Design an enzyme around this catalytic site. Structure first.
Site, PDB file in Angstrom:
ATOM      1  N   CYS A   5       0.805  -1.217   0.000  1.00 31.09           N
ATOM      2  CA  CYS A   5       0.000   0.000   0.000  1.00 31.09           C
ATOM      3  C   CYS A   5       0.839   1.269   0.000  1.00 31.09           C
ATOM      4  O   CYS A   5       0.272   2.360  -0.128  1.00 31.09           O
ATOM      5  CB  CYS A   5      -0.940   0.017   1.207  1.00 31.09           C
ATOM      6  SG  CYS A   5      -0.118   0.105   2.801  1.00 31.09           S
ATOM      7  N   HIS A   6       2.159   1.156   0.166  1.00 32.17           N
ATOM      8  CA  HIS A   6       3.066   2.280   0.012  1.00 32.17           C
ATOM      9  C   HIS A   6       4.278   1.952  -0.852  1.00 32.17           C
ATOM     10  O   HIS A   6       5.055   2.862  -1.161  1.00 32.17           O
ATOM     11  CB  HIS A   6       3.538   2.771   1.388  1.00 32.17           C
ATOM     12  CG  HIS A   6       2.430   3.287   2.248  1.00 32.17           C
ATOM     13  ND1 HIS A   6       1.793   4.483   1.999  1.00 32.17           N
ATOM     14  CD2 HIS A   6       1.847   2.774   3.358  1.00 32.17           C
ATOM     15  CE1 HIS A   6       0.859   4.680   2.912  1.00 32.17           C
ATOM     16  NE2 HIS A   6       0.867   3.655   3.745  1.00 32.17           N
ATOM     17  N   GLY A   7       4.460   0.694  -1.250  1.00 30.39           N
ATOM     18  CA  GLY A   7       5.558   0.322  -2.119  1.00 30.39           C
ATOM     19  C   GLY A   7       6.909   0.568  -1.488  1.00 30.39           C
ATOM     20  O   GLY A   7       7.695   1.376  -1.994  1.00 30.39           O
TER      21      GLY A   7
END
Ligand code: HEC
Ligand code: HEM
Ligand code: HEM
Lengths: 370, 158, 74, 237, 98, 47, 56
Positions: free
Chosen positions: F11-13
């Site tokens: 969800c944030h890489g």
């Protein structure tokens, strides 16, 4: 002779310049009773066990005779509930209810009672956003030093969310509306010594009128609009607000790419998400709510309302932009075009309230010499 | 005081709600006015009206025969005692001879009354009290004075 | 609290009529609609421009976000 | 991401219902194709009554499949022909076996998948019909495949559907498209066994509330008319 | 220049359109309840009828015609003499207690 | 507080190692090592 | 008029008033369902059970 106390809802003095806004002041009595009534019949088939709860919802929507409606009269009812409040509360700012200090504080304790209640209501069906929706928010209370790990583990019934976390909410969640049901009377009691508060803000003692014919039906007319706007959603778009993911079973070993709790947190959740620091935004969160207790020491104008303070209207409706923005910005992910917003929008919220609304009355008094 | 016959009057003497009231029956050509005049303090207005309407609806529906004989025997002594001398006699004459046409002898006033019973009253009061569109007035501390709507909603029993 | 001991009033007259003696909705279209517009012209200027910017910030919020996921020449 | 379009349907209209004939062929698909690896656990044959099949006919399918039920008096369990109360045959006893039957990947359930995925039907119909050759500069492990609608555009979805993969009862074309229509019609019914009735109350509501709302709005304006027409004056000496 | 604005802002509040004055729109506290209570009948009664009709029009959302509107120059300061009188007694009531 | 994927905060890489040390991402720290003990070369006591 | 003649008969007395309602409501119920369902059938012709309730 308990017939004399129920004159407050029959033969009570009240003004006559009253808008359609104050329908909303009593719809909560209809939302709350309806919502309770719905949920009560609804919990006739809920189960407080992980292995069956999500299924126990499916026991309703499929096999019960017309019970499938009840999932949505209740659930999306809770959205129509909040739609009243932030039309009920911003009112008090746009008209000046908040001078009634003994009442305005009561109007807060409801909100934290509910917004901590509703948080326990989205979580029951184990939707894969129930779990993480409970994880993220509750995890934050670890932000405190030296006790955050304790209370959180203490509420999780262990070291992480589990069956033991569930039942502890279902009782905490099945109960507070009744606590609200009595606090509702309290909220009307301190009123009863002073009565309502017109849009103009003027003490309208001279023009107080009966209540059984006039505002009764007027509220019923509003209740109709409520039931309409409620029957519409459930019948035509029940999947609108209730996110799709919550129909998924729970599994801790996988997350969605995008997280967001239900839409109504989002003005508040975004304020925290703005802050890269952990604790530095948490205290801003409750402060963003508990500022309401702090406003009435900022009634600078010796007027009351804002129908007669045009500059206040320029700010007030600007505040709505920020909330309705943080609503949307909250429900969207963390990327550069959006971080730049919340770093401002969060500050704008605190800024409009504590600087410019006070600044108005200090000026508007000077614009008219008192 | 308490011992009186009019239930309205007894309560007014009991709790000292009002200080005075009167009724009337005006007659004009195609119409008149039926009603009452009452006089009380600003903390007693609503209850008198609630009781007052409480009497009209009672007679629209539940009129005891014995209580009719009360008033039938009031009205006899009214018109007669009204006619004590000569000047009252010519009030009636000079008035009846523009309104009723003829004069009506007192033996005729009696025969009309003797036809009356509670069956008649329940028809009449139902015709002119019940659910009609009354006319109100007030000059004083009428702070308690309810609204015409509530008054009309108090006009019809149930 | 109730009616009777609120305040003082002197030399004031009130006229009013039954509902039955008047139509419920007279001059609704004929007189209401200007009053709607008059109500509008006094409020739009202090209500809209926030929402005007909101529509734009809602616009540019997507476009810049839309471009960022689209690649660069490299 | 990729946003599916808004494909029309026989039920998109706010008083539109489901083509039950389309459902009748749709159920054939799940049994012949998807029931090998999809575990629909929240449904039974009985719910198909009044929808696509009858009592006796749908019961013929309960006689078809064996089901594990009943502690024998010996103290063991056995297999019987199912009945209308019995939910669908689960393909695999647990999730892990499904991961083992695949390239480490799991099939999701398909009971509420429609309402648990943005766009619902339009996602699914375009999902199957979004297969194409991979683009240049892309590489994928074996078992994985390409489909743009899936997040990451990388999926262990073996192509389940193709033209003339089976045949249906009445004899309509077994194209990749018509089959893809009935199946998505079928799944919407899964997470909505009430569609036929939601619109019914969907309609009863309006011709009441549309009919009441003026009347109450009049009774309002009726009582308030005293004050909508109230005049004043000011006559001191 | 200033004085054009006080006249202007006075028109944007709107209460000159409901036959009201500056003083009538004041917030009520114990300091002012005394002052109002101290007012004479010839003027006090003249307060109510100004207020009483503006309410009835706020009910309708209506206003008065342009002629009946209130002019800035006639926005009399009838209440300020009674008011500052009070707070002259308030501040004496407190600092003397100190 | 989400689930990184192995070979990575989705969800944030947030790029991690196989060991789990952050290379790139909003994730401020390398991930949480719990305390533990190995009784043997084939068993674990995680805690 | 019909309005007036209606008043003297039914809406005058309260005990009579509720009589009209449940009676008319009963007769109203029988019509409203028939109105809606036929229309719901009129829209979605060739889709429902009763339009395939003869093949099987
Ligand atoms: C060969 C076994 C098999 C068949 C047959 C099969 N599926 Fe799949 N399905 C899978 C597996 C394995 C996955 C896992 C996808 C992943 O891991 O990303 C999957 C994924 C899915 C998903 C998940 C989509 C999402 O958004 O998460 C859906 C929906 C689905 N299948 C529906 C279908 C449909 C429709 C058909 C018939 C056209 C079908 N399945 C036939 C094995 C199968
Ligand atoms: C202000 C009060 C409440 C709020 C904010 C609230 C919140 C919610 C919400 C939003 C849902 C939606 C779950 C879904 O749609 O799937 C829910 C479900 C539920 N509510 Fe509450 N609720 C409240 C009161 C109640 C009451 C009064 C009861 C019982 C009398 C109750 C019992 C339940 C149960 C059993 C569920 C599970 C159903 C489901 O998840 O679908 N709740 N709650
Ligand atoms: C279940 C929750 C609530 C119930 C049952 C309730 C009930 C009511 C009712 C019936 C009124 C009178 C209607 C009106 O004034 O328009 C009222 C007024 C008011 N409410 Fe609520 N309310 C609730 C929540 C709240 C909340 C969350 C606030 C937050 C500030 C609040 C603050 C007020 C205030 C200040 C008033 C005064 C009205 C005035 O000044 O004229 N109430 N409440």
């Amino acid at each position: 002779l308990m017939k004399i106390v129920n004159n407050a809802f029959i033969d009570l003095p009240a003004p006559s310049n009253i808008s359609s806004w104050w329908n909303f002041g009593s719809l909560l009595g209809i939302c709350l009773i309806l919502q309770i009534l719905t949920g009560l019949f609804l919990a006739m088939h809920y189960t407080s066990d992980t292995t069956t709860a999500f299924s126990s919802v499916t026991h309703i929507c499929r096999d019960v005779n017309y019970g499938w409606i009840i999932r949505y009269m209740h659930a999306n009812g809770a959205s129509m509930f909040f739609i009243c409040l932030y039309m009920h509360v911003g009112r008090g700012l746009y008209y000046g209810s908040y001078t009634f200090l003994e009442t305005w504080n009561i109007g807060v304790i409801l909100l934290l009672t509910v917004m901590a209640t509703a948080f326990m209501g989205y979580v029951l069906p184990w939707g894969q956003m129930s779990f993480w929706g409970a994880t993220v928010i509750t995890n934050l209370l670890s932000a405190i030093p030296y006790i955050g790990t304790n209370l959180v583990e203490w509420i999780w019934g262990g070291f992480s969310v589990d069956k033991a976390t569930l039942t502890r909410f279902f009782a905490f969640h099945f109960i507070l509306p009744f606590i609200i049901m009595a606090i509702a009377m309290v909220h009307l009691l301190f009123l009863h010594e002073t009565g309502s508060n017109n849009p103009t803000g003027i003490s309208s003692d001279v023009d107080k009128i009966p209540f059984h014919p006039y505002y009764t039906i007027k509220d019923i007319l509003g209740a109709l609009l409520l039931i309409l706007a409620l029957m519409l959603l459930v019948l035509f778009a029940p999947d609108l607000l209730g996110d799709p993911d919550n129909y998924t079973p729970a599994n801790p070993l996988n997350t969605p790419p995008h997280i967001k709790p239900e839409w109504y947190f989002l003005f508040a959740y975004a304020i925290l998400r703005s802050i890269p620091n952990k604790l530095g935004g948490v205290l801003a969160l409750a402060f963003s709510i508990l500022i309401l207790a702090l406003i009435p020491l900022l009634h600078t104008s010796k007027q009351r309302s804002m129908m007669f303070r045009p500059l206040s209207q320029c700010l007030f409706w600007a505040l709505v932009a920020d909330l309705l923005t943080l609503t949307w910005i909250g429900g969207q992910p963390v990327e550069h075009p959006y971080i730049t917003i919340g770093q401002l929008a969060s500050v704008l919220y605190f800024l409009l309230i504590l600087v410019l609304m006070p600044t108005a009355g200090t000026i508007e008094n000077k614009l008219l010499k008192w | 005081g308490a011992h009186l016959s009019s239930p309205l009057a007894s309560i007014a003497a009991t709790n000292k709600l009002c200080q005075s009231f009167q009724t009337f029956n005006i007659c004009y050509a195609d119409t008149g006015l039926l009603g009452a005049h009452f006089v009380c303090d600003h903390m007693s207005i609503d209850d008198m009206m609630f009781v007052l309407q409480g009497q009209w609806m009672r007679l629209c529906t539940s009129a005891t025969e014995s209580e009719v004989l009360r008033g039938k025997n009031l009205l006899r002594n009214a018109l007669v005692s009204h006619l004590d001398g000569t000047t009252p006699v010519c009030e009636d004459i000079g008035r009846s001879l523009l309104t009723y046409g003829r004069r009506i002898p007192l033996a005729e006033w009696e025969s009309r009354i003797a036809e009356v019973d509670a069956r008649v009253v329940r028809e009449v009061c139902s015709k002119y009290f019940y659910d009609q569109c009354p006319a109100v007035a007030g000059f004083g501390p009428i702070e308690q004075l309810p609204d015409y709507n509530r008054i009309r909603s108090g006009m019809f029993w149930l | 609290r109730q009616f009777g001991h609120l305040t003082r009033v002197r030399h004031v007259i009130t006229y009013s009529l039954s509902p039955f003696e008047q139509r419920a909705f007279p001059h609704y279209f004929s007189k209401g609609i200007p009053n709607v517009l008059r109500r509008t012209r006094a409020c739009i200027l202090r209500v809209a421009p926030p929402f005007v910017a909101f529509y734009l910030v809602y616009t540019w919020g997507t476009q810049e976000f839309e471009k960022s996921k689209r690649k660069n020449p490299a | 991401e990729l946003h599916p379009p808004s494909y029309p349907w026989s039920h998109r209209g706010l008083l539109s219902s489901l083509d039950h004939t389309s459902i009748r062929r749709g159920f054939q698909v799940y049994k012949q194709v998807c029931s090998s690896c999809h575990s629909m656990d929240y449904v039974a044959y009985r719910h198909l009554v009044g929808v696509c099949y009858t009592e006796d006919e749908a019961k013929a399918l309960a006689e078809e499949v064996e089901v594990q039920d009943g502690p024998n008096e010996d103290g063991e369990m056995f297999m019987r022909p199912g009945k209308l109360s019995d939910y669908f045959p689960k393909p695999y006893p647990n999730p892990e076996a499904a991961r083992a039957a695949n390239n480490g990947a799991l099939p999701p359930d398909l009971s509420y998948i429609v309402r648990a995925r943005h766009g619902g039907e339009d996602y699914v119909f375009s999902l199957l019909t979004g297969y194409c050759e991979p683009p240049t500069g892309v590489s994928l492990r074996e078992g994985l495949y390409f489909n743009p609608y899936f997040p990451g555009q990388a999926i262990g979805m073996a192509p389940p559907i193709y033209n003339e993969v089976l045949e249906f009862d009445d004899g309509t074309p077994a194209t990749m498209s018509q089959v893809a229509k009935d199946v998505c019609t079928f799944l919407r019914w899964a997470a909505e066994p009430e569609h036929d009735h939601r619109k019914r109350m969907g309609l009863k509501m309006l011709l009441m509330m549309g009919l009441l709302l003026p009347l109450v709005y009049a009774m309002k304006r009726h009582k308030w008319s005293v004050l909508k027409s109230r005049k004043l004056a000011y006559r001191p000496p | 220049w200033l004085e054009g604005i006080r006249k202007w802002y006075y028109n944007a509040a709107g209460f000159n359109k409901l036959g009201l004055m500056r003083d009538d729109t004041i917030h009520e506290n114990d300091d002012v309840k005394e002052a109002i209570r101290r007012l004479p009948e010839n003027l006090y009664d003249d307060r109510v009828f100004r207020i009483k009709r503006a309410l009835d029009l706020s009910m309708r959302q209506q206003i008065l015609p342009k002629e009946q509107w209130t002019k800035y120059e006639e926005d009399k300061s009838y209440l300020e003499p009674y008011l500052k009188e009070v707070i002259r007694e308030r501040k004496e009531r407190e600092e003397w207690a100190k | 507080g989400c689930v990184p994927i192995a070979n990575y905060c989705p969800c944030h890489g947030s790029h991690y190692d196989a060991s789990g040390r952050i290379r790139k991402g909003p994730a401020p720290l390398n991930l949480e090592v719990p305390s533990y003990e190995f009784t043997s070369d084939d068993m674990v006591i995680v805690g | 008029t019909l309005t007036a003649r209606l008043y003297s008969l039914l809406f005058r007395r309260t005990s009579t008033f509720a009589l009209t309602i449940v009676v008319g409501a009963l007769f109203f119920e029988r019509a409203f369902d028939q109105g809606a369902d036929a229309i719901y059938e009129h829209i979605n012709e060739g889709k429902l059970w009763k339009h395939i309730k003869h093949k099987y």
